[PDB]
Each structure stands twice: as C-alpha cells, then as structure tokens.
Amino acid sequence: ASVHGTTYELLRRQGIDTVFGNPGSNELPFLKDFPEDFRYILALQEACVVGIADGYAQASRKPAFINLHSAAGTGNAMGALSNAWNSHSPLIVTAGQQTRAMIGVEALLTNVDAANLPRPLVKWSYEPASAAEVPHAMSRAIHMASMAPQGPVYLSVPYDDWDKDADPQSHHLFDRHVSSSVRLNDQDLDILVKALNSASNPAIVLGPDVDAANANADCVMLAERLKAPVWVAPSAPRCPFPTRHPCFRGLMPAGIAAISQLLEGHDVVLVIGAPVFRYHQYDPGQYLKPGTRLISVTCDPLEAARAPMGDAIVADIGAMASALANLVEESSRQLPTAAPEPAKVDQDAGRLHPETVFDTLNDMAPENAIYLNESLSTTAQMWQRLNMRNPGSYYFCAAGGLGFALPAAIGVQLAEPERQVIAVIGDGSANYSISALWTAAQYNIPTIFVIMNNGTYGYLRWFAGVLEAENVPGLDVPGIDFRALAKGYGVQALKADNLEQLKGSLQEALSAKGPVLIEVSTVSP
C-alpha cells in the first residue's frame, strides 16, 4: 500500500469522510485519486475553510478534517484557529509541504519551521521525519484532536510522501479506540454530591463544553433536583440549557464584580464545562463575595489551573453531568420560577431595533432552529429573546474572532440538514469571511444569513464608552451593499428596511430551497 491509500483508510476507519479544503500544489498528491466515499467541500479562502469545518465539528460533535496549502494557507486560517482553540473544537488541520528534496533550499511554498507556525493555537503540531511515518502521525493528529479537552491540531506533510510505500505495520492504527470518558472516583464524587445535597442556596453555571458533550438534558435534571438557578458562563460560545426552562437565568455579564454580585448569597456555585471565567470588560472587584464557594468541573487542565478561585475537578463533562444528575437528592426547596417574557420595544415604520428583529425571528423560526451570533452589540437582547429549547442551538466566536459565524453557519447547516440555521451577523463582521457565501451557494447549503446593518462597528463605540475614549478613527463602515455581495457569490438576496419587509423576507427565506441573505436596516447606536 501507499502512504496515500493507507492514510485514507485510517481516516475512514476513524469515521472521517469529508475534507474541508482550499487546494494548492503541495496538496495535489494527497487529493489526487480522491476516494469515491469521501467528499470535498471547497471554500475560497482559508478562514472560510476552517470556519465551515469548525461549525461542522461543533454541531456534529466529532472531528472535522481540513486540508490547507502550506504556510500562506495555514496563516490565512490562524484567526479561525484562535476561535477553535477557545471552543475546544476537534479540528485536524493538514497542510501540504514542499517535496523533501527542496525543503532545504526553501523553494517557493516551503512551509519554513512549519510546526511552529500555528502555535500557540493548537494542541499538537508536527511534521513527520519520513513518508512511512505519515499514517502514524495522522493517527496521532486524530486522537490528539479528539481526546478531552478537544482542540485543533496541525500536521504538515511533504508532498512527495503520499506516493511512497506505507509501513505494513500501519494497519494496527486503523481501529484504535481511545477514550477520555472519565469521571471523579467514587469516594470523592460522594463527597461532592454531599456538598451539593447540603447546600442551602446552590447556583449552577454552565459553559460550552456542556453543549459539546450533549450534557444539556443531564444538566436540566441536575438543576431540577437541586432546585437551582442556572446561568450561562460569560462570552458564551454555545448554549448549554433550554432558555425558557424555569431555572434559566440567562447569560452572565463578562465582568468580575458583576459576577460576584450575581452570585452573592449563593453558598455553593457549581460551574460545569466553562472557564472560570471568560470575562471581557475590566470590572474590578471581588472574585466571589463572602459566603460563596465555587466548585468547577472542567475538561481542561488549563482552565482548572488558571481559575482565580474555587476548587476544580478535571474530567469528562458528559460523564460528570450524568453522574451528578443521577446521584444528587431531590431538594425539597421550591423550583425556581421562570424569568418573565421580555418586553416589546416600541417600533415605528422605519429602521429596525435589534429587539424587534429577535422577537420576529423567535415568532417565525422553527422550534428547532439553530442560531449563530456575530452581531456583537446585540448579544444580550438575542439571549433574552430567542427561545432555544434544544441542544446545539447557538454558536458565537469563542475567542471573539470575527469571521466565524458566516462560514460556521454553513458547516452547522451541513451537519444538521433538518434544522434551519439562521446566522445573525453585524455589517462589520459580515466582511471578514464574506467569500464563505460561495460555498453555501455551490453546495446548496440552505443557511439563512441575517445581516444587521447599522453602518458602524457598534460594540466598539460601546467599549469606547466604558474606556471613555474620544477621537477614535476607523469605527464606521458605510457603503456596503450586502445584497450585491450575496449576488456576487450566487446567494439569493433580500432587503428589509422596516418590519413589514422583515416579515416578508423571513417568510420567503424560510420557504426557500437554497441559502438566503437578508440585509436588515437596523437602528444606529
């Protein structure tokens, strides 16, 4: 067997059947004789390739495979990799290297010092020392991406390796099963359960690793047994809980003082599947108020190490959530009462308030819609106004890197063909990965893109307020016609300048058989 044949066999034996890519000369020997059972999804720029693969991996809850071109293709993807690192996305990033005979002279499109290029945004980064090692290196990449805490990995392969003879002993790689599905030992788990059972006013805080683990239903059971309010940890990349469940209390503000104030009076705060905490704005104060102690369950040693307070347990979130949900007592406290519905904001016949847009989306979208958020100044309103009952219903750029939601929405829609994906993206954010629209058109992936057009980088005007910063350049983005951009890439385009048009446009988009972009004229901040 060749290294080519062996490597594709390893990939299919490990469940991988799709390559998200933008091709180059160093990858042609890998992509040639492309196997019939695989599919290749082309995107026109590498931030888009990785974004699509990332949405696909997060929604499918399995690794996604990426093929990029040498240093320039990998470099174009590095902002996308920053998000993937923070969302623990299991991404296997492969990049083609020059032929081994011309690496030394640094021929054009040699990836120099290749393994160092994507650091520090990958769990593992490597170039094999010989062609016969390639399948073993690929095996390492698959398992490193897939073991808790999941994350992106990088493998650089000289293009001449693929046609070489594989090692016959590589067959032992094909069926390896590697598990990190672990939970706290019985004695210490009993101690934790007793602390939860004994708490007089527990609170629960959930992060993205709950949704990645599909631990959402177990966390519902846990919250109901403990009769405890549930918050989502700040800067949330996913939604880990039904947002209209009686225990749900919403997204935490991303500030130190704000969070300790919210938790005040809670004696035990159990955090599951989140960093402690992904603050954003600087809001100095107490990490916790007196009387509050914190216990964190995290799949990531790096999270447990850097928490500035609390105890921590490093374990699989699925296994831990299930064990806790099944072991805790039913408290005799009263179940928390559901948060009230949000108020209707006054809306005239002109430009749309974001609140109106979210209320209308909530009124019209299917109950199993999946949303993406890259409309940064409207996040709080989005979380208050969209009823998201099911797991996998929300994605937001985990490292704050714009250019995620547009391509990720396409990968999510590819992963979940029977759930309507609706990406809500600001006019500024829409440009970072605009060319991803083309992939939705070409493969007819029927994502709906709602562009919130207010002409400005609104969130940065806000943060300028908290910093009290005046005379800042570069905050306005006038003069972009998103319907023309959508036409340019073959996506049906609609405009909504008022509520009547928003309703009509959503009705058309929801009914459409292909992707649709709706440009919404929203109010300026």
Ligand X SMILES: Cc1ncc(Cn2c(C)c(CCOP(=O)(O)OP(=O)(O)O)sc2=O)c(N)n1
Q: What residues from 229 to 268 belong to the interface with a copy of itself (CB under 8 A)?
A: 234-235, 254
Strands of 375-461, DSSP E:
394-396, 421-426, 448-453
Closest approach of Ca ion to the CB of residue 356, in Å: 16
Window contacting Ca ion (CB under 5 A); options: 205-213, 244-252, 256-264, 457-465: 457-465
**How many whole angstroms separate alpha carbon 407 and alpha carbon 427?**
15
Task: Check binding of 411 to a copy of itself (CB under 8 A).
Answer: no
CA pair distance 426, 378, nearest whole angstrom: 9
- Following CA atoms 425, 510, 243, 327 in sequence, which dihedral angle do they give, to the nearest 10 degrees? -110
Name the residues that contact ligand X, by CB under 6 A.
Answer: 22-25, 69, 72-73, 76, 79, 375-378, 400-403, 426-429, 432, 454, 456-460
Please report, as residue ranges, which positions from 33 to 72 form the binding site for a copy of itself (by CB under 8 A). Answer: 33-34, 40, 42, 44-47, 70-72
Q: With binding defined as CB under 5 A, does residue 151 bind Ca ion?
A: no
**Six token digits for residue 227:** 């009769």
Helix locations, 421-524, DSSP H: 437-442, 458-467, 482-488, 499-511
Q: What CA–CA distance (Å, rounded) separates 264 from 275? A: 19
Query: 105 is written with which tokens?
Result: 């002279």
Please report how close the Cβ of residue 200 comes to Ca ion at its closest, in angstroms: 45
Residue 316 is a binding residue for a copy of itself (CB under 8 A)? yes
Residue 25 designated active-site: yes
Bond before 65 cis per omega within 30 degrees: no
Q: Which is nearer to Ca ion, 87 or 522 (CB)?
A: 522
Find the binder of Ca ion among 426, 435, 491, 492 (CB under 5 A): 426
DSSP states of 33-85: T--TT-EEEE-SSHHHHHHHHHHHHHHHTS-EEEEEEHHHHHHHTHHHHHHHH
Spot the catalytic one: 25, 60, 180, 331. 25
Q: Is 427 annotated as a binding residue?
A: yes
Taking CB under 5 A as the binding criterion, the range among 30-38, 448-456, 465-473, 489-497 that sits at the site for Ca ion is 448-456
The nearer residue to a copy of itself, 137 or 382, going by C-beta atoms, is 137
Residues 110-169 interacting with a copy of itself (rule: CB under 8 A):
112-113, 115-117, 119-121, 124, 127-130, 132-133, 136-137, 139-140, 143-144, 147-148, 158, 160, 169
Annotation-wise, does 494 bind a ligand?
A: no
Taking CB within 5 to 8 Å according to partner kind, which of Na ion, ligand X, a copy of itself, none is near residue 454?
A: ligand X
**Is 280 assigned a catalytic role?**
yes
Q: Which two tokens stand for residue 3?
A: 């290294």
Residue whose C-alpha is closest to residue 87's, from 118, 115, 116, 51: 51
307 binds a copy of itself (CB under 8 A): yes
Active site residue 353: no
- Please, are residues 35 and 19 in contact by the beta-carbon 8 Å criterion? no
The size of the chain, in residues, is 525
Residue 116, annotated as binding a ligand: yes
Residue 454 marked ligand-binding: yes
> How would you classify the pairing of strands 448-453 and 421-426?
parallel
Residues 6 or more apart whose CB falls under 8 angstroms from that of 256 comprise 277, 279, 283, 284, 285, 286, 287
524 binds a copy of itself (CB under 8 A): no
By CB under 8 A, tell whether 99 contacts a copy of itself.
yes
Whether 177 is catalytic: no
Nearest to 386 by CA among 359, 368, 355, 352: 359
| 113 interacts with Na ion by CB under 5 A | no
Asked if residue 119 belongs to a known ligand binding site, the reply is: yes
Of 168-197, which residues contact a copy of itself (CB under 8 A)?
A: 169, 172-173, 176-185, 188
Active-site amino acid positions: 24-25, 27, 46, 69, 280, 400
